[PDB]
Design an enzyme around this catalytic site. Structure first.
Site, PDB file in Angstrom:
ATOM      1  N   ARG C 160       0.830  -1.200   0.000  1.00 54.98           N
ATOM      2  CA  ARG C 160       0.000   0.000   0.000  1.00 54.98           C
ATOM      3  C   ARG C 160       0.886   1.281   0.000  1.00 54.98           C
ATOM      4  O   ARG C 160       0.464   2.339  -0.465  1.00 54.98           O
ATOM      5  CB  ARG C 160      -0.937  -0.008   1.217  1.00 54.98           C
ATOM      6  CG  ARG C 160      -1.758   1.283   1.474  1.00 54.98           C
ATOM      7  CD  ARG C 160      -3.066   1.371   0.670  1.00 54.98           C
ATOM      8  NE  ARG C 160      -3.985   0.286   1.012  1.00 54.98           N
ATOM      9  CZ  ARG C 160      -5.214   0.158   0.523  1.00 54.98           C
ATOM     10  NH1 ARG C 160      -5.688   1.049  -0.326  1.00 54.98           N
ATOM     11  NH2 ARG C 160      -5.964  -0.875   0.871  1.00 54.98           N
ATOM     12  N   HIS C 390      -5.145  -3.300   5.216  1.00 52.18           N
ATOM     13  CA  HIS C 390      -5.092  -2.244   4.228  1.00 52.18           C
ATOM     14  C   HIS C 390      -3.649  -2.019   3.702  1.00 52.18           C
ATOM     15  O   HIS C 390      -3.397  -2.162   2.507  1.00 52.18           O
ATOM     16  CB  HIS C 390      -5.641  -0.986   4.870  1.00 52.18           C
ATOM     17  CG  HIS C 390      -6.241  -0.032   3.894  1.00 52.18           C
ATOM     18  ND1 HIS C 390      -5.652   1.172   3.575  1.00 52.18           N
ATOM     19  CD2 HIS C 390      -7.391  -0.100   3.182  1.00 52.18           C
ATOM     20  CE1 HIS C 390      -6.421   1.804   2.708  1.00 52.18           C
ATOM     21  NE2 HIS C 390      -7.479   1.055   2.453  1.00 52.18           N
ATOM     22  N   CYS C 391      -2.735  -1.672   4.616  1.00 47.77           N
ATOM     23  CA  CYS C 391      -1.311  -1.442   4.351  1.00 47.77           C
ATOM     24  C   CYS C 391      -0.658  -2.619   3.567  1.00 47.77           C
ATOM     25  O   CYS C 391       0.229  -2.425   2.736  1.00 47.77           O
ATOM     26  CB  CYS C 391      -0.536  -1.209   5.696  1.00 47.77           C
ATOM     27  SG  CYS C 391      -0.092   0.527   6.129  1.00 47.77           S
ATOM     28  N   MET C 392      -1.095  -3.849   3.834  1.00 47.58           N
ATOM     29  CA  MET C 392      -0.535  -5.012   3.124  1.00 47.58           C
ATOM     30  C   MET C 392      -1.116  -5.324   1.757  1.00 47.58           C
ATOM     31  O   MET C 392      -0.827  -6.386   1.211  1.00 47.58           O
ATOM     32  CB  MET C 392      -0.610  -6.268   3.988  1.00 47.58           C
ATOM     33  CG  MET C 392       0.357  -6.234   5.163  1.00 47.58           C
ATOM     34  SD  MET C 392       0.679  -7.839   5.806  1.00 47.58           S
ATOM     35  CE  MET C 392      -1.044  -8.150   6.343  1.00 47.58           C
TER      36      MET C 392
END
EC number: 3.5.3.6
Lengths: 409, 403, 402, 406
Positions: C160, C390-392
């Site tokens: 992300r 989300h970030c991944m």
């Protein structure tokens, strides 16, 4: 009954642990540094994991005592509760507007529950409707103050730190951080009033929750009764020379030890404890962290009536591993290093606890070192470090041996 | 009689303490260990001090220098026994050194002795022995401090350790265990020194033979303004547990009518770092923090458990101090146009409109000389490197009242 | 085909992910911090929970692309590999004498071993014995310096951060720390050379690896296209305004965004760290922060010399977001009864379905109450990175809603 | 004579310095970390110590050049100025909606006030009212950002850092920290345009404010052209091997150096440049911080025509100190250890000529010992000028200094 620890490797018959709980349940990202705890943990997961560890030992016949349990039975004896509250709930610790209310409420509770609170701290929130409370809700709600009447002790999970059973007696470790001495208090109540201890026979080498102890600090991880009349004590950032010496002294006087080998931890790598770089797996096998162990400066401390202070001290020029080997009759020690060639990843194999010669409890995440120990002949029974290892301490940190046989040296 | 009856009243007798051996021992390494921001230039720092000392002496104030009191004080063998019995124990020096060390200090001439007692003693200071050597050895091979008795470089901030609130004093229970040594030495002086022993006054709070646990109180947080009112900063260094016991002891001896607790916002300092008096209605401030102090006023009440009643003030801090003094308003000098940044809080009143401040706060200074204040300046280049200043280097003992 | 992200809750169809790998195997308590990576993790376990996550999405029919394969197949194009290598291995990067050695060896490796070393860094030891590398081991041993021909990039785990898909267009974000720009590169080449994108239909909104972007830094976490021309973007320690202006200007050019609300974060964090959608009209917040963010609306302004009008919002963020989407009011669930968990950073698969972390039991339960379906994965080793779902993930093809 | 520095302890003829200025007045305790400044200093007082210091070399007949000044005489040239603004004002550096306002404003300024800002930075307030600065004072309003559209550059006070004169040439150092690159940009304008430079013979060995440079970084503190055709370039926390290789490489190719002794500096988290633990005070005198200099692992790059890259590197055995004395064809360096009335740190002094250094007032001990070694010690106040860490050496960028064996 004869409680005592005459080794590091011999069969452990009785140990004490403490499961995570309310202490850790009060943990936040913002308050863990000031509460002296590494990082926040998934408490229900960690409670489970611990129960697993605990059960793998019971499964092997070891008696395993849980601090919450012991505390609970202890608290039921009115005299012992009073001995604690008299010390924990004072004007100095809780404030004059809260002494009474706090104490009456604690006393109104159920044994189990009251123990949870003693180890886990009490929040203005938990207190029953009242004013003294609101004033705290207020400083918290208007200044950003700690909402703690009684600060929680998450470091109880590490039973090793608080007390040390060295042969036929125990120490009441003066903890470095004032805050942590609250832990030592609770553990003394147990050793002083709990059925299983009050009537057992053992000595008390050092420590007193009543005295201040000043600059004298001693910590569990640093102490090792290796048998053969010898005791290793790490001198570092946590255990001072002024405490060790008083312990040695108290020991040589009851004729309890012959020699105490001070493992001088070098300032750099002295921000830790001995059992964090040095551990026994078998009578003649240790796991070692090189960068620190190759730098440890040993000192042999032996009694002497030629001395007014009754002891003699010498700096060994032999290495710690050599000094340790010879202290045990051994030619050398077989060494497994841990913490560049085969290592698929980084791992730190130390701090595994012994159940009996060659049988160890370790962490599942330390697969490299774990193998290395098996090849070296040790049975490694693992457990999960996902939440328990977010404390860096291992099975050795989560255990305070109480009864454990020695071996022939 | 001994007492401090205001912050801006006429100062007649003060106690300070110049830099010295404690500081000579400072190293970029033991720097934090010893709880001192930085390593100063000692000799230069002493000169700036004597200067600060001479300036107040010129204005006729009586200036007592700690080393002198201690030196005079330990000439009373009983006074020395009192301290050494508490300072030299197995827990502080260890079994092997308590004898040769006490022996060696007891043999020193008073001035040298007060020097060490304040500046600490290194293994090197001791005549050859096993112990000294054992100590040097751990020092050589492991890097531990070779301090038998660690230095007390913060002695130079006499304001921290004891507080003179009206007709009595407090022996403060310092946050950090280590600095409690400091308070030990002062207590000794208050106990045996001639200017003290036969002096009439009470001890409101504090005892060096006790473990106050969570009760801690720091000098820079206390301010007996006058009008039977005592301002006390509540923060990262002055706990309520201590504070409650002080207000209670006070009321109990009819020494005060109100204790306004200045709740420092969570934003590591003392009230006196962001609030200083200069004149009856003049105060320097640090807006950002000062405007966020949640004010609490504790008063005596026979209808309250503890015997005290506390209420959260609604008005600003600044207002609840104005009206607590019986003044309409307070004149305010904000600090912390004007060319460069500067913080000129922490100045000390020699009497109304007369304040000793730092040379470097050129701005804040003129802003005060503009409000009709004779700002007598000294060197901050060394005495101030330690984030501290005037109010901090002084511990009032006798300061006349105001109206 | 046509690549693009039109919403943060739409039916996710194509996401890029990157599993922990050799990158994390080089982590050590010493080097992790000088390597911008939180703490040292148990790689094998992390590889497993990752795979478990990747699996939980492929069975809901999502097409999932993993970086290592993508790179691999990508560098199997002599061109692509030359394009990365001419860039990765230079004199300033590697050391004037190693360039030859380091490139020769890498160029002699099978794709799946090369790509791994690309994301995972190459240590002196890794190189065939030479007077070259052997000098580095002398420095690594005698001086205690990092011994990295190429440095490991463990942050590639969070796909992300380096690129954003803002409706049929993507951004090649200039990361804050210079080192992390090494990640932007490899994903760029993948967007540039791989068959999946190479022939693809999509614009390139902002950024370029051949450029040095000064104080212009942008980081995936803040960017999130929420439906119709609206696009949220955090302006905090990691996404600078210099970049935000140029992105909004750009979108205003091809007219791919009507409004760009700039959420000015207060006080080390990103938007999706305190703000996350789970349903058409639902979010999770960290009140303490959200409640204190100063909104700012961006709209095309022909009269402007620099083409925009920077107005500022007067209502709160949740009192803006809800509007630009026409909801009556935004359903809010808070995080930041049992213990403490931070429910934020949940990636949304479709509306009412969210992959979250297993340790955040409370929040998951709250989310479930609010109606969401929570599929959870383990944060034991992947959560040792402050971030989550989300970030991944870097969404590449998500459906709009309205 | 021609520009160039041929030793570290020989007759100093020309030196560039930079007094504390407007950048320092922007320092607050809230931001000297983002600016790389230990602490907040009394600016006008530091101005007097800096000047005191200047005066002391000036009365000894050393052409002392000052940056703010050279920058003004330089900024005079419209080209000189285009080159600087063109790089300092960009949509990336200041963003879309401020480029023009800020640049136009800067240009309507008196050359010496403009110099003031280049080095001291420019805040929003400094600009006339506008939609620009205001919807920018607004960010600083609630969000509480860094009001600077241009940030000050307080380390300019350490001219040694951003560029070096190694024999008949100079290096335009690629600073570790990006923010510190903006400095090198200014000193470069000065070397490119200002009269005393753009019409002088010297080489540009390494460096370019326009190029990226990646993991290649250098800091003036680490480099020392000690004479005898040798260059001491300490490798550590701020100067990397990638930059040193390309530096020596050029030094060899052009024939300005015969050998380069990389002083492998022991890992430690805090900066530590060679001139902060190692200082030349005379042709055979040096100060030293034992605890470090002993950990130095010398290396000797020498040119090798047959090698692909043009050199070869060996690892010296003897101490970094014998590998130096032997490097000057000397029998053995005389060292004065620093770091016993208190704690004194004498490193970082600068010679004006053999046996004559300028150091701090406060390091009374070390000085006493240098004077015990035959060194004349002229001291200057470090109360503000030294609240930093470095001293004499760290505050000077020698442009013309003579060879030794004189």
């Amino acid at each position: 009954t004869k409680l005592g620890v005459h080794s590091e490797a011999g069969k452990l018959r009785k140990v004490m642990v403490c499961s995570p709980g309310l202490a850790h349940q009060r943990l936040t990202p913002s308050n863990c540094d000031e509460l002296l705890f590494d990082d926040v943990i998934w408490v229900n997961q960690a409670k489970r994991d611990h129960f697993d560890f605990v059960t793998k030992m019971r499964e092997r016949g070891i008696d395993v005592l849980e601090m919450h349990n012991l505390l609970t039975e202890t608290i039921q004896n009115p005299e012992a509760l009073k001995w604690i509250l008299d010390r924990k709930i004072t004007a100095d610790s809780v404030g004059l507007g809260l002494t009474s209310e706090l104490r009456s409420w604690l006393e109104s509770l159920e044994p189990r529950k009251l123990a949870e609170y003693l180890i886990g701290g009490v929040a203005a929130d938990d207190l029953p409707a009242s004013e003294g409370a609101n004033i705290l809700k207020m400083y918290r709600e208007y200044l950003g103050h700690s909402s703690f009447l009684l600060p929680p002790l998450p470091n109880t999970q590490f039973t090793r730190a608080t007390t040390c059973w060295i042969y036929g007696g125990v120490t009441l470790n003066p903890m470095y951080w004032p805050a942590r001495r609250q832990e030592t208090l609770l553990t003394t109540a147990i050793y002083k009033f709990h059925p299983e201890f009050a009537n057992a026979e053992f000595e008390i080498w050092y420590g007193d929750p009543d005295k201040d102890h000043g600059s004298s600090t001693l910590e569990g991880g640093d102490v090792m009764p290796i048998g053969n009349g010898v005791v290793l004590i790490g001198m570092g950032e946590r255990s001072s020379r002024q405490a060790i010496g008083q312990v040695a002294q108290s020991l040589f006087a009851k004729g309890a030890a012959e020699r105490v080998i001070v493992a001088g931890l070098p300032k750099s790598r002295a921000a830790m404890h001995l059992d964090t770089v040095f551990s026994f797996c078998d009578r003649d096998l240790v796991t070692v962290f090189p960068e620190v162990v190759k730098e440890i400066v040993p000192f042999s401390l032996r009694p002497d009536p030629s001395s007014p202070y009754g002891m003699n001290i010498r700096r060994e020029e032999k290495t710690f591993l050599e000094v340790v080997a010879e202290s045990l009759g051994l030619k050398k020690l077989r060494v497994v290093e841990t913490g560049a060639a085969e290592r698929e990843q980084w791992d730190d194999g130390n701090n595994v606890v012994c159940l009996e010669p060659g049988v160890v409890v370790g962490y599942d995440r330390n697969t490299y070192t774990n193998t290395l120990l098996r090849k070296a002949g040790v049975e490694v029974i693992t457990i999960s470090a996902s939440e328990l290892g977010r404390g860096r301490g291992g099975g050795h940190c989560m255990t305070c041996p109480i009864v454990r046989d020695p071996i022939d040296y």
